[PDB]
Amino acid sequence: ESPSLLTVIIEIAPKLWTTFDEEGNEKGSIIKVLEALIVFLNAHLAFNSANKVAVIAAYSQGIKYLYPESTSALKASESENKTRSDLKIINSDMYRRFRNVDETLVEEIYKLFELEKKQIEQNSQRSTLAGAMSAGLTYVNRISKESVSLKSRLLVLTCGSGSSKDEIFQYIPIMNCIFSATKMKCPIDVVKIGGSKESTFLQQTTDATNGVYLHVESTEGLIQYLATAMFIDPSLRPIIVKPNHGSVDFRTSCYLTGRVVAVGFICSVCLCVLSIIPPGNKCPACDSQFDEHVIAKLKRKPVVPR
Amino acid sequence: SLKHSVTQYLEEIPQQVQNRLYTSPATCLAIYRILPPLAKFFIMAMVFNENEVPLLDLDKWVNSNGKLQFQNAIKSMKSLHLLIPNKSSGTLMINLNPTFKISLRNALTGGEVQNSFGVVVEENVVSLDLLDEYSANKWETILHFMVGTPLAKIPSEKVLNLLKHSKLMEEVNSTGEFKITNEGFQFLLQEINSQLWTLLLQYLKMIETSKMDLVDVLHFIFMLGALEVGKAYKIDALSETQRIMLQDMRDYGLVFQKHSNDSIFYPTKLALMLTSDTIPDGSLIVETNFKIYSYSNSPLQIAVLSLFVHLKARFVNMVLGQITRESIRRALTNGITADQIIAYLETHAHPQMRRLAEEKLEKKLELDPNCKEPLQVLPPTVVDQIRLWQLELDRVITYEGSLYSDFETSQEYNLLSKYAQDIGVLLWKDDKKKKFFISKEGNSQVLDFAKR
Amino acid sequence: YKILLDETHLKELFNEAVTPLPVNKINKGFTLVKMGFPTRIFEDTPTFCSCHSKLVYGGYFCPNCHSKVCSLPTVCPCCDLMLILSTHLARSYHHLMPLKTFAEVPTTEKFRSEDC
Amino acid sequence: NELFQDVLNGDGESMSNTCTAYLKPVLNSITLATHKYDEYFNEYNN
Amino acid sequence: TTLKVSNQQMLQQLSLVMDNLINKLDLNQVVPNNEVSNKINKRVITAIKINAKQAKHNLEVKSTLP
Ligand SMILES: [Zn+2]
Ligand SMILES: [Zn+2]
Ligand SMILES: [Zn+2]
């Protein structure tokens, strides 16, 4: 009926994928997930005539756009599109609507891999995934305002591989993406490949935006996971149930300790979550000097007769 | 309409013909688009897995808010022969059509396509300068032929025989003119993609010869939908049957082959327009005094305006016309009903009557909030005049047939009258007058009832 | 004290009236606030919520006293605990991190890229 | 407990499960409160 | 709170991915072996059953009690 937009956020990190390769019994798992993504994009473009596809990778040294290709294509030596430098990666008897998009994205994949190999000497401690789906929502709104309507949806191809834990800098931008996606009613679908069973922030992202979370552990047969569950278009979202069996608690980590929080305290100025009363009677975040009376009232003992 | 029309056409296709039709990946990809999105989702979920899935899993997949949509999709896919229902272990096991599944997987995974999508020869021009106006000219040729305006270029005899065998476009050669039916202006109601669809379903209803099969026609039209405009394609993949329809729609203008028997055929923009869609021209202005001010410059819009509006003048912007009684009589003698003309006026109304219409609806709701009225974009005076003209066309109505009278016994009259009423051919009856009339179509049935 | 000018400026007054007002420097209400994080209980049996005494299938069990409520963010009507979600404080983080305005580049200087 | 055993012999256990499960969470909450009261009482005793 | 790998094998894994991209990707290799498909389908259907049983039932609702 109404066409949609399939925006996809790919998490490419050499350390994460290679630790998945080492933990797994196979090498070259990203080729498998790449071709699974390609046939997913072909399935999405087969779903409707007018639906569109965006794919964005979040590499170590930043983010780059994979489809649609950057507008520097000028039918020149640096065009890098269509028959210009058309290196034979996929077969030429493909459907041309599929052929153009798949060939362009795999050329951009190889170009990103060349650029990341050229900067293999520097190891980034910062993950660019949160800014990646931030720009994904930005392009979603670009398509929504340019084309009048059209639905939209996000897919997240993330990987933990038991090496990267749940980071602290990935708290605020993820919920900014959650509220933005809730504003444009864009579902957020997340599949996590790796040994780490639970990713709490992404679980809340799927739950709060009417999306689906599915953690996976084997690179084989992932298109069953994708085209079985990740294909719920926004046209039929309310009439299809979700396989998101994992139940998230919508909790948070404490600031000065880091553990998952229970009934506790916050600063009434900087509003960070504290499992216990911080030392020095001052905030660890905004250095707000606290009244001794109120923390005496919170340190006050409950009463029972002798 | 469009999706329902092609679905009902492909319902008429036999199951073995449908299974032979599912061979090419282009046909499977085209019919995949014609499924409902719930049906499309379930089919593509069933595509990649060789194991067969019970119907209870698909039923549990759907929320209770879309149970009716799920049942409608099940009806559509069962009628489309895409499911093999299997009875095993007390369960109605469901299996996808294997040829359809294989061809669709090849269309997705880049498998065997047997050049169903054509081949590019990398010699091509821009569509706007050569292809687009050729397609527009070839479409407007048959349009301006069928509306009846004189032309210097007339189409080929094939489309003439197609229109003659069609329900619309009744023809007479002893008079020297081509009569437009109601179905003709009904064809002019919808937008050109569904016009092309109705044209091609009438074509397939026409072509029953041994010279042409069916699966090749469907393959060719679905790959024409699959082709892209601005790149030529080689004629070698088509069969000689598909080549003679390549010539046939080259005459139509769906495809531009620059010369006959050439090896390069250029798809026109109508080929992509056929699959799915995407102040305007033809936006008209009507007043209380039946005046016509049309923001139109295409000859086809004002040509079809000429059938029911007495045109007085034509600017580079306007076509000065007036809704006279005689123009409406010209419309109604063609079978063109008044409500369809009213709908045409509503769809082609200028946005200024739209803003004044929402203004007067705001006045109506602020004056009488207890009742709501539909948005009359055009004033009801002209609509009432058109309805009065329609009614005065048929002030008396003349139903022809036969009448039985002269019954000496009331029981014979009553039995014949109730027999006529039961078969729904009686128009009047009374035992006092001892007469009852039956229609012309019901004459022979009652005559053989009385003879036996 | 704001006075509107036209129809749209009134909605402007509302949507900058939704913003949190900056507090003065002399205001010292720098306190800690005790509140807990309830968990969404899941049950096919409807149960009496502590706020309304009505049968609600869902609910949020209070971490302090294990009492269910209908909506969040609401106080717990058993132990007076401000039951919340991470989403409710999440909606309020962004005021504490206001984005600096994006400075449009000069047209004379060499642009970084052709696309955004 | 009186209401639990009144529907035990009143409706003959066919409704007693529903009556127990309906009032289960508030019973658990007040049981937790009494447990905390007794725990603090023993804490002051110790 | 409630594996470190070096750049050499990064480079060899990168080269393996790049020449595996260069030579061929058969897109039909994503089709399961009809065995893992059954297990993953069972997982998906069980998750669907659990979510549908929970979300089947969710003004107060009518009760069987008088
Ligand atoms: Zn603070
Ligand atoms: Zn309540
Ligand atoms: Zn409580």
UniProtKB/Swiss-Prot annotation, chain A:
Superkingdom assignment: Eukaryota
A Pfam match: Tfb4
Subcellular compartments: Nucleus
Sample GO molecular function, one term: zinc ion binding
PANTHER family per UniProt: GENERAL TRANSCRIPTION FACTOR IIH SUBUNIT 3, TRANSCRIPTION INITIATION FACTOR IIH TFIIH , POLYPEPTIDE 3-RELATED
Functional note: Component of the general transcription and DNA repair factor IIH (TFIIH) core complex, which is involved in general and transcription-coupled nucleotide excision repair (NER) of damaged DNA and, when complexed to TFIIK, in RNA transcription by RNA polymerase II. In NER, TFIIH acts by opening DNA around the lesion to allow the excision of the damaged oligonucleotide and its replacement by a new DNA fragment. In transcription, TFIIH has an essential role in transcription initiation.
This protein's name: General transcription and DNA repair factor IIH subunit TFB4
Protein species of origin: Saccharomyces cerevisiae (strain ATCC 204508 / S288c) (Baker's yeast)
From Swiss-Prot, chain B:
A GO CC annotation given for this chain: nucleotide-excision repair factor 3 complex
Assigned keywords, A-Z: DNA damage, DNA excision, DNA repair, Nucleus, Transcription, Transcription regulation
Record carries keyword Transcription regulation: yes
InterPro entries with a match to the protein in the record: Tfb2_C (IPR040662), TFIIH_p52/Tfb2 (IPR004598)
Primary localisation category: nucleus
Molecular function per GO: ATPase activator activity; double-stranded DNA binding
Pfam annotation, one family: Tfb2_C
Signal sequence bounds: none
Superkingdom of origin: Eukaryota
Subcellular location: Nucleus
GO biological-process terms attached to the record: nucleotide-excision repair; transcription by RNA polymerase II; transcription initiation at RNA polymerase II promoter
NCBIfam families: tfb2
Something else known: Present with 8900 molecules/cell in log phase SD medium.
Similarity remark: Belongs to the TFB2 family.
Assembly notes: Component of the 7-subunit TFIIH core complex composed of XPB/SSL2, XPD/RAD3, SSL1, TFB1, TFB2, TFB4 and TFB5, which is active in NER. The core complex associates with the 3-subunit CTD-kinase module TFIIK composed of CCL1, KIN28 and TFB3 to form the 10-subunit holoenzyme (holo-TFIIH) active in transcription. An additionnal subunit, TFB6, plays a role in the dissociation of the SSL2 helicase from TFIIH after transcription initiation. Interacts with TFB5.
Name this polypeptide is given: General transcription and DNA repair factor IIH subunit TFB2
Organism whose genome encodes this protein: Saccharomyces cerevisiae (strain ATCC 204508 / S288c) (Baker's yeast)
Classification of source organism: Eukaryota, Fungi, Dikarya, Ascomycota, Saccharomycotina
From Swiss-Prot, chain C:
Segments crossing the lipid bilayer: none
Zn finger intervals (C4-type): 62-79
Domain of life: Eukaryota
Protein location: Nucleus
Further information: Present with 2340 molecules/cell in log phase SD medium.
Sequence similarity: Belongs to the GTF2H2 family.
Assembly mode: Component of the 7-subunit TFIIH core complex composed of XPB/SSL2, XPD/RAD3, SSL1, TFB1, TFB2, TFB4 and TFB5, which is active in NER. The core complex associates with the 3-subunit CTD-kinase module TFIIK composed of CCL1, KIN28 and TFB3 to form the 10-subunit holoenzyme (holo-TFIIH) active in transcription. An additionnal subunit, TFB6, plays a role in the dissociation of the SSL2 helicase from TFIIH after transcription initiation.
Function per UniProt: Component of the general transcription and DNA repair factor IIH (TFIIH) core complex, which is involved in general and transcription-coupled nucleotide excision repair (NER) of damaged DNA and, when complexed to TFIIK, in RNA transcription by RNA polymerase II. In NER, TFIIH acts by opening DNA around the lesion to allow the excision of the damaged oligonucleotide and its replacement by a new DNA fragment. In transcription, TFIIH has an essential role in transcription initiation.
Name assigned to this protein: General transcription and DNA repair factor IIH subunit SSL1
Source organism: Saccharomyces cerevisiae (strain ATCC 204508 / S288c) (Baker's yeast)
GN (gene name): SSL1
Swiss-Prot record, chain D:
Domain of life of the source: Eukaryota
UniProt signal peptide: none
Subcellular location per the Swiss-Prot or TrEMBL entry: Nucleus
Function: Component of the general transcription and DNA repair factor IIH (TFIIH) core complex, which is involved in general and transcription-coupled nucleotide excision repair (NER) of damaged DNA and, when complexed to TFIIK, in RNA transcription by RNA polymerase II. In NER, TFIIH acts by opening DNA around the lesion to allow the excision of the damaged oligonucleotide and its replacement by a new DNA fragment. In transcription, TFIIH has an essential role in transcription initiation.
UniProt family annotation: Belongs to the TFB1 family.
Other comments on record: Present with 5150 molecules/cell in log phase SD medium.
Quaternary structure note: Component of the 7-subunit TFIIH core complex composed of XPB/SSL2, XPD/RAD3, SSL1, TFB1, TFB2, TFB4 and TFB5, which is active in NER. The core complex associates with the 3-subunit CTD-kinase module TFIIK composed of CCL1, KIN28 and TFB3 to form the 10-subunit holoenzyme (holo-TFIIH) active in transcription. An additionnal subunit, TFB6, plays a role in the dissociation of the SSL2 helicase from TFIIH after transcription initiation. TFB1 interacts with XPC/RAD4. XPC/RAD4 recruits TFIIH to the NER machinery. Interacts with the NER 3'-endonuclease XPG/RAD2.
Protein name (database record): General transcription and DNA repair factor IIH subunit TFB1
